Amino acid sequence: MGGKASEAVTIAFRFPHRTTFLVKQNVGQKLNKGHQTFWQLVAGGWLFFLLINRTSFKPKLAAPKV
Amino acid sequence: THAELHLFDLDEFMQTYKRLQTRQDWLIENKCKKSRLFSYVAAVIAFTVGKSATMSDEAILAKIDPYVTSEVRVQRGAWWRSGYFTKEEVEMMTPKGPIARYYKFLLGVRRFPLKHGALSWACGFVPAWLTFTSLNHWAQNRRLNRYLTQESVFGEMARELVRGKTADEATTSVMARVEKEILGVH
Amino acid sequence: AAPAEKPDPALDATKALPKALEEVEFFQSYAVRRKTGFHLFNRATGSPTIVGPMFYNLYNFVRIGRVSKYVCWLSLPLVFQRMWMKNRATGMEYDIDLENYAPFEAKKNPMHGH
Amino acid sequence: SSPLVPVWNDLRALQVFTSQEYMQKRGPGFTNTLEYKLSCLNPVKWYDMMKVMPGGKAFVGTALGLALFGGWGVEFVKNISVMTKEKPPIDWNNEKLGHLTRS
C-alpha cells in the first residue's frame, strides 16, 4: 500500500539548481521617482477603510427600558 | 476590548441552547463570519501595501522579473543565453495579477527602501495585524449590539450579561423564562 | 554517484559466531566435574539423557549467584500447594442446588451476560 | 507499485511533448491572440502561474486551493455515498421557537 522513495524522484532532481547572484549596471533607473504624495493618500485610505468599518460597543442598548 | 468577554459566555449559552436560535441570530452570526473572512483579504492587502513601502527595486523585480519567478523550474543558463527566450516569450512568463501590476506601477513611485529582513516585513505585518484584529473586534462589537436589540432568548441573555451579572445567574434567569413562556412548564 | 569506497572490515560478519561460541564455551567450561560422587541415571537402553548431563553446569552457576539462589525457590512451595488443592477439588462434595443456581464459569448464564 | 508505470509514463510523455510540438509549430504570435490577452485578466492563470513561483508560493497556492475549494471537495467525496441513500424529509425549522419579549 502506498508508494516509496525508490519509486519516485529525489529532492535533488526536483530543486536541482544551485544559486547564482545576478548584478546589473546602474543606468539611472531608480532615479526621479514620482508620486511623492502616494503613501500619504494610501494611509488616508487605510484609515478611512478602518473608520467606515468601525463599530463602537454601545452597552446602553441593554439598559432596562422595560 | 470588552465585548468578547461577554460573548464567550453568550456563545456557550448559544451552543448549549442552539434550539432557541432564531433566523436573525443566524444572520448575525453569518455577518460576523463574512466580516471575519474579508478580514483575511484585508490583512493580505495591507501586508502587501505596507511591505511595498520599504522594498527596493530589486525586491520588486524579484516578483516581476521572470528571471526570479522562474528559479524553481528553469535553468539560470536559459536566461544567460541571449535569444533563448524571445521578448513575447519573456512577456508571457511575467506575472499578470493585480499585485504584479501594482508593483510595476510602484517601480516609478518614491518610497523608503530598507534592507530585506524583519523590518521590511514588520512594516506590512503591523498594518495587516491591526487591520485583522480591529476588524474582527468591531465585528464582535457589532454582533453584540445586534444581539442586544434582538427580541429573543439570546438577546435577553446578552442583555443580562451586559448589566454586569454572572454567567450562571443569567442562565438561570433566562431559563426560568424559557421554561414558562417557550416550553410551557407543567 | 561513483564514490569508490574501499571495503570496511568492521561491516563484515566474521566475529559474531566466534563470540557466541566463546560465550557457549565459557558456559560449558563450568560443566567440568570430577569422577568422585558422579552418578547419572541413563535411559533404559543405557544411553544418556539430554537434561541429565547438563544439570551440573546449571547448578554450578547457581552456586555463583548471590540473591537468586536464595529467592527463586520461594515460589516452589506454591507448586505443591496446587498439587494438594487440585486433589482436594477432584472429589469435593458440593450442594446440587448451588451448583445448578450458581455454576462457576458455565455457559448461557444470563446473569453473566450470555 | 504496479507494472503499468512505464505505460503511464509513455502516455504522459506523449501528451507533454505533443503540446510542446504544437507550441513550436504555431511559432510566435501567441501574445497577439485573444486567448493570451484574456488569460492575462484570468484569475485562474494568475493562481496557476503563482503556484510555481519561489518564496513559499507553492505552499500558498496549495493552502489557498485547500481553504477555498478543497473543503468543498472533501464534502463532495463524502457526499458520493449519500446521494444514493434513502434519507428522510428535512425537518425545516418552523421559525416559531426562540422569540421572547424583553424585560
Add this chain to the structure above:
Amino acid sequence: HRLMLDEVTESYKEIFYSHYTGQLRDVRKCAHLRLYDGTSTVLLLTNKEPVELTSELLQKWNAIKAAKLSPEEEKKARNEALIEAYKEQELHGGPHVKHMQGYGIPADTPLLGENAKGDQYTQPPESASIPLEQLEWTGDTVFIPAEYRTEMEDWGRELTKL
C-alpha cells in the same frame, strides 16, 4: 572519510587546533579552507552568449578604464577584449559552469517530432543571427561562488544564529 579533504588537513589543524600549540596562524591556511568549495566564476552577459571573466580580461578592462578614453574607443576596446576572451573560452571547452553539478548552460533547443527538419534536430536562438563582431557587454553579471560546502544555506538553523 567521506566529506573531509586530505590536503586541507594540516591547514585545518593549524586554524582550529592552534590553541593547543600556542603558535600563531597564517591567514593563507584559512584561505585553504576554500578548497572545500568549487571555483568561483563570474559570467558577463552579452548579446550573444555569456563569457567567463578571467584575470587577463579584467586586467585589460582596468587598463582601458585607466587610459580615460572616449566611449567610442572605450566600448570598442572592451568589446575587442570580450570577443578575444569568448574565443579563448570556446577553445578551452566552454565556461567552467557548463560542467558543474547544480549549474549549467542549456544547449540549443530541440525540435520535436515533425518540427525536426531532417538532420537539423535543433533550433538555435535569435542571437545566433547576430554576427560575433557585434559582441557587446549587456552590463549584466552573474557571480557563481560554487560554494558546495561553505554556502550559508547549508549552514543550518543553529550555525547561522551562532
Add this chain to the structure above:
Amino acid sequence: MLNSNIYIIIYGGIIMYSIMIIIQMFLYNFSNKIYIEVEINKYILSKNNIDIYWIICNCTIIIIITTLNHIINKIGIYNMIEYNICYWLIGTGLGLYISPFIVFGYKFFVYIMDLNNYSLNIYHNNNKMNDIQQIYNGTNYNDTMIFFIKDINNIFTIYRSINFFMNWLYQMIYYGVRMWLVFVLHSFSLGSFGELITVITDNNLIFNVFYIGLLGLGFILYLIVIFYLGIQIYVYISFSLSFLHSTILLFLVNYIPHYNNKSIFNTFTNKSIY
C-alpha cells in the same frame, strides 16, 4: 446540571513503572549505539545524521528495555505492555514514523508542496517549451479546464504529493501489528500447551512429577523465549530501518562531486567590474 459534561478516565500503575525504564538507560548506556551508527551511515549521508540516529537509539533502547522488563521484571504493566496494540502502534511505531519528518521535515515539506504543482519530470531537461508550459500554464500537462473540478483536484493532488510517503506508514502499522500478534499468539499457544499438559498430569499423578527437571525445562524455555523474542526485536528494528531507507531516505540522495578551486587568494567582486 446541563453544563456539566463528565468524562471518566481508569488510571493505574504508570509513574513508578515508567521511571525505571528511563533509570535503566544509564545502565544500558545505549549499547545499541554502534549498530544504529552502522545502519544510518549505510542508509544516508547528511549533516542531520546524528539527529535521526539519536532518535532511533532512544526508541530502540526503550523497546529493548521494555522487552527485557517484559521477560524478567514481571510486574503490572511490564507484562501487558508488549501484549498491547497501543504500545506497538503509538509507543514504538509512531516515533519511528515521525522521526524522518522531524529531522528532514523542511526538505520533505518543500518537496510535498512542490509536487502539488504536478508535472512530468524530464532528465536532461534542455527544452525551452517545458519552461514556458511550467511557468505560464503551471504544469507540463494540459491544465485546460481542470479548475472546473478544482475542489477535488487540490485534495487529490495533496495525496499525489504524499503517496510516496505512505508505504512508510503502512510498514510501521504492519510491523507493529506483527509484533503484537507474535507476542500474544506465542504466549497464548505456549500457555495453552502447558495447561493441557497439566490437565494430562493432574489426572494421572504418576506423571505429576518434575519429569524433565526443575531447571532443565525452565532453562530450555528461558533460552527459547529469549532467542525467539530477540530475533523478533532484531527483525522489527532491522526491517523498520531498511524500509525507512527504501521509503523515506532515498529522497535525500544528493551526491556532490568534489570540484577543485583555483581562485583561492583572489575573488572577483562587484567592485572588480563596477
Add this chain to the structure above:
Amino acid sequence: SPNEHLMFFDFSSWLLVDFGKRWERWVSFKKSFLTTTRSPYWSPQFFLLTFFQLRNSNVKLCENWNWAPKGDDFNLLHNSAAEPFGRDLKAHLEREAGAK
C-alpha cells in the same frame, strides 16, 4: 490462565473530569487575565485567548445542515414493515379477528 497473563488489572482508580466545568474555569481565567492586565484587542494575548474560541463558536452556530450525520439520520438498520397486501394483511386481519 494464559489470557489472565494477557490482562492488565493494575488499575488504581477512575479519574472523573467535568470538562464543561474545566472549560468554564479556563474561560474565566482567560477573562481575568485579560482584564487584570488591561490588554488591548490587538495584543497577541487577546488574540490567542479570544479569536479561536470565537471562531469555533461562530462556526458551530452558523452551521445549517440540511441532514444530520450519516449514522444518525439515515443509513440506519430498520426492520421491514408489514405490507398492506398478501400474507401480512391476512395476518393482521386474523389478529384483529382473534383478539375480537
Add this chain to the structure above:
Amino acid sequence: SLPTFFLAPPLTEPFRARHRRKCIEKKDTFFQCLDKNKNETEPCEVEASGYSQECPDSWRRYFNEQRWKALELKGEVKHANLKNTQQHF
C-alpha cells in the same frame, strides 16, 4: 462538485422523470388489481414483479404506507400497522 450539482441536473431531469412516470404507472396498476382481487397477491404476480422491479424500495415503502392509510379510510382494516414507518409531517 460543480458539474455534478450545476450541469448534471438539467441533463438527468428527463431520464429520471421517465422512471418516475413508469413507477407511478406500475404502482397504480398493481394497487388497482389488488383492489380488484381483494388484496390478493396470487393472480397479479406480473404486476407485483413490475412494481418491485421498476419502483425502488424507498418509493415502495411510501406507497405501502399510503395504501395502509387508504385501507384504514375505506374501512377494510382499523389501526393499520405502522411499526417501522416514517412518522414525518
Add this chain to the structure above:
Amino acid sequence: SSYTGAALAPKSERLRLAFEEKQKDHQKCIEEAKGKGLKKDELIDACAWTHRKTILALKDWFAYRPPFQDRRSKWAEYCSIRHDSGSWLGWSQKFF
C-alpha cells in the same frame, strides 16, 4: 426482513420522544422512592441516574437546531446531499 434506510422520525421528534421516555423512567424512580418513604436527600441518591439521563436527553434536544430553509438547502435537497448552508469554505471553515 431488514433494510438500511432513512430514520423513521425526524431528529427533533426523536430527541423529544427520547426525553419523554427518560422523563417516564425518572418519574417511576421518584414515585417508587416516595412509596418507600425516602426524603429529599435519599431521593437524590436514588434517582440521580435517571435525572442525569433526562438532563442529557434535554441537552441533546437543546443542542440540535432544525435547519432553516433557503435556496442552498433546497438545492442540496434536490441534489440529495448533506450540505451546510452556513459555510463558505466547507471542511476548511473549521480552520477559518
Add this chain to the structure above:
Amino acid sequence: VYTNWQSSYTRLFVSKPWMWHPLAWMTLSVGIWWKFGKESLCNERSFYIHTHPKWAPHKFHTVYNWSRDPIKWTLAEQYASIIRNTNTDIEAVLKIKLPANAN
C-alpha cells in the same frame, strides 16, 4: 567554557531535533486520544462499552456484573454529589413539556 548542555536547556532543545521528537510524539498521542479515544471511550455516554465482552474483554477481571452495576452506582453517587453542591431540584425536570418542530 559555555555550553547549553550545562547552562541553558532551552537552547539545547532548540538546537537538537532529536529533542523535539519526544515532544511531538507526546503531542500527537494526546491529540489522537482527544480526537478518537476521548468521546468514544471516556465520556459518560460512551463508558458502558467497557462492559462489552467483545470490545473490552475482562476489563473488570471478569465478565461485567450487570446485577451489581458498579458504573451506575459510582456515577450516581457522583451525580448526587453534584446535585447537592448545586442544590438543584430533582423533580424540576419532570415539569417540562418540549414542543415539536411542527410542519
Add this chain to the structure above:
Amino acid sequence: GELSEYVEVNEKGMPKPQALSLWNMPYAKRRALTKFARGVRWQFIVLFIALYNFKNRDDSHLLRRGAYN
C-alpha cells in the same frame, strides 16, 4: 528504475520508450488523442462515479413532501 512521472530523453530531445512506443503515428493523431487528455486519471473516475450516483440519486424525501404529485 521506472520511476513515477519520470521520463528519459535521447540526443534528439525525444522521450525514450520505457515500455511502449507511440511516436510512429503522425502528429495529427497524437494531437487528437492528447488534446483532451490531462495530468489527471483518478479524479475523472471518481467524477464518473459521482455522476452515476447523481443520476441514480434518491428522491424519496421529496416524494414524502409531495413534489411529484
